[PDB]
Amino acid sequence: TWLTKIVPDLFRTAGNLHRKLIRLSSDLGEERIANPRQQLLFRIEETRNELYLLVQSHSPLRVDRLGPGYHQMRNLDPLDKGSRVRYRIVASPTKRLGRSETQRLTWLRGAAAEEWWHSRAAANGLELLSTYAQDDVRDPGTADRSRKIRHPAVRFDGEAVISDVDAVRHAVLNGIGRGKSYGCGLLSLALI
Amino acid sequence: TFVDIHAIQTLPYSNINRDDLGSPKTVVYGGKERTRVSSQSWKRAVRHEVEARLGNVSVNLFGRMLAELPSTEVDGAVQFAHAFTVHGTTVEVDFFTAVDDIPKENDHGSGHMNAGQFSAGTFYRYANVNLDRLVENTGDAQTARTAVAEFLRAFLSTVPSGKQNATAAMTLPDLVHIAVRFDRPISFAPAFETALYGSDGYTLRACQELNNYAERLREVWPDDAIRGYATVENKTDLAALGERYDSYPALIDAMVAAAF
Amino acid sequence: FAHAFTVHGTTVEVDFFTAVDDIPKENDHGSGHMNAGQFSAGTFYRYANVNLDRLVENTGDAQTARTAVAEFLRAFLSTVPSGKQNATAAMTLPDLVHIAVRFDRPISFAPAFETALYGSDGYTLRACQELNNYAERLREVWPDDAIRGYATVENKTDLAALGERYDSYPALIDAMVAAA
RNA sequence: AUGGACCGCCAGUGAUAAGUGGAAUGCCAUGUGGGCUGUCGAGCCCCACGCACGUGGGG
User: Fold this and answer.
1) Which distant-in-sequence residues (6+ apart) come within 8 Å of B160 by Cβ?
2) Which residues are registered as beta bridge partners of C14?
3) Same domain for A185 and A93
4) Which residue from A9, A35, A136, B228 has the least number of CB within 10 angstroms?
5) Which sequence ranges form a coiled-coil region, renumbered to this chain (chain A) (predicted)?
6) Stated in angstroms, how far is C4 CA from D7 C1'?
7) A106: Cβ under 7 Å from strand D?
């Protein structure tokens, strides 16, 4: 993978955030499996002005119109088990259930979000997830370009001893939780 | 058919006309005294300029030759209003002394002390042309046509020659508005019956005030008058004065075209 | 020769000076004389015409008229009236010069500065730019084949309407006099 | 076409020379910003799976 610090300017909506992330990468690929996760990822870091954002990626980004005045960028290749390292992350805990008139949506509170998350990591890296328990988007009018929704993210943080390296790294590259294209998924680690 | 033309031409520090004394001529109008450039002085310069560029249409457009004996047409049909300032103007004294070149065992016993008056302001000029009688008297509509066009250009281009070497008052009007009227000629002089206040200039404000007076008079008496105006300012629209034109000679051309 | 006035409004600045007595007084030391002289500063607009037909008519020959015109224009740029210059040292070169060679009639740009400039900032750039806009608007309103040309100290603006730019005042004077 | 019609007040000009506003000067003496406090289930669509409880993919 490879990491960059980038910052869009004029961002009014989340979908245009997605599009500004894909229009700077020409050769794009998508390798999918029926039920498993798709194989960029990204995290919103400062949103009231322009919008600074950390991107994880496979294909190299170069500045575009109204981009940075420079191409930071580093290419990284990943992490010994038993050792603790800093984590991080935004995701959307949900419960899907039959809806009157299907619906994404202990169990809310800060304890089934912790249950949900450590479910997400599973045998990979053991961690503690900052529990949130509370973003809107609409289509920019372009045909076949989504529509309008709501949503709710949660950020999580600390050091996460990993129990399987290739598989937590697998999780780092695949992403944790739905809506990866709308801010979620990216797990960030650092040595303790 | 009456072609009349209004100009808002400003003049820097100058003394174009003066009294039997040195001070310039003034109307007391709207309660506020205001310097003026008398009609005959201005007319003389325009007539001299027309006759110079044109190489008896001068006895027709202008009533008669001053140095020729009357040829039964003393009336000139053309009417020249006396130019007067948009605002009230106080007479500005300029004290001056001519220097004696030969020096005595004395310094500065200057050759001649005196003081002459000058003034500056934005004069609101205006004129009229009785087109029909000009055609009936001149005969050919074409000579009349060339003469009318050249008379308007002379009205615009010229400035009187008076104390001009001491004050280069040569200037072009900021606004001209030629209105081919069939009912009767009308001067927008009452637009300035209330002299404008100062410190921000007067060209722009006098331009829209004259625009307000043209809207109101056009409102009370809607007419078939063909109108148009050219300005040195593109910042403000004056829809009541008619269609705007890119320049003065283009304007004069369109209104000479409109009379016939 | 027009009266050079300021582009901007100027209040008369008063300076209070006291000529000092030199021998010390035994008891009361005071000024020998004390008064207040008025001074002022600003960016003047200057204008002048030369009627070539009359100057050629006066000198008779066109060659002495040519030297007289070039010499006049150079004097117009170089000279300063010298009024209390020993106490103020007001010697200065004009910030901008614009020679036009017109055939129909001379036109002063004094109406361009009838609306006084507000202030707080340097009037030179705004005065040059305003004279530029008025020269542009007059060339559009009153079309003419007059040979124009200018020379300026500031390089912050191109001033397109003032004609062909020349690097120096003598080059400009020589070009426009040679053009007439 | 009006005691009117036609009709320039106008040619020229340095306001000049000379000039310290100068000497002296603490805004000083006094002061808590204090008490209170774990950050721990609707969400619009497409598709794949499902033990139709629910999982996951993408927008």
Assistant:
1) B16, B17, B37, B41, B42, B44, B45
2) C38
3) yes
4) A35
5) none
6) 34
7) no
